[PDB]
């Protein structure tokens, strides 16, 4: 239950497979809905049950309500704490671009990691999680851009 970044694994396939990543903060585990599809999770010999989730936001929290409330300032570089399948956690610094939608602007990071990296946190300079990586779009030249997806606290 310690704070930090965690891999989301399954053994229902060949060997052990990393389906995503998430953030433990204030006793709540945070990941993207498409990683777990809202299923319960095991942590050691304990169980984490879903508490809140929303397919359109593509987010889910376990054991309590969504706790992450920091937001990109729109100006400064951020860091993706990428936890790729089978690889050590590594920080990647970038200046986000912007997703412009009919409902306002969202920060976006032009960094391409395997699908199992979904749920990795994006951080501001204070180390606060400003959103999660892994819900995005493929742009004209074929490369992948992720929204900085943040919930409501």
């Amino acid at each position: 239950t310690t704070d930090g970044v965690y891999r989301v694994m399954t053994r229902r396939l060949l060997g052990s497979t990393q389906v995503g990543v998430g953030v433990m903060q204030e006793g709540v585990f945070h990941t993207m809905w498409h990683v777990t599809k809202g299923a319960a999770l095991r942590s050691g010999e304990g169980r984490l049950d879903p508490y809140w989730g929303d397919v359109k936001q593509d987010l889910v929290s376990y054991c309590g309500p969504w706790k992450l409330d920091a937001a990109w300032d729109g100006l400064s570089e951020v860091q993706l704490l990428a936890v790729p399948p089978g690889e050590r956690a590594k920080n990647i610094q970038t200046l986000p671009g912007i997703f412009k939608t009919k409902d306002g602007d969202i920060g976006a990071v032009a960094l391409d990691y395997p699908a199992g990296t979904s749920g990795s946190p994006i951080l501001d300079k204070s180390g606060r999680v400003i959103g999660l990586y892994g819900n995005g779009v493929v742009i004209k030249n074929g490369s992948y851009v992720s929204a900085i997806t943040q919930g409501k606290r």
Binding site: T2, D3, G4, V5, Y6, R7, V8, M9, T10, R11, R12, V19, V21, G22, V23, M24, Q25, F29, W33, H34, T36, A39, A40, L41, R42, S43, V55, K56, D58, Q79, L81, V83, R88, A89, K90, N91, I92, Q93, T94, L95, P96, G97, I98, F99, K100, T101, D103, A108, V109, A110, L111, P121, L123, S126, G127, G136, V137, I139, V145, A147
Partner: protein
Amino acid sequence: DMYIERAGDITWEKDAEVTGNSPRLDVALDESGDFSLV
């Protein structure tokens, strides 16, 4: 049946590698939570 495994602390790294551009994109978000380009 899925399980979680700790991978590290959540901290800013002072001398991280810097990469990626900063695209400004018009996008739409549908009821299924999927983004598309406009």
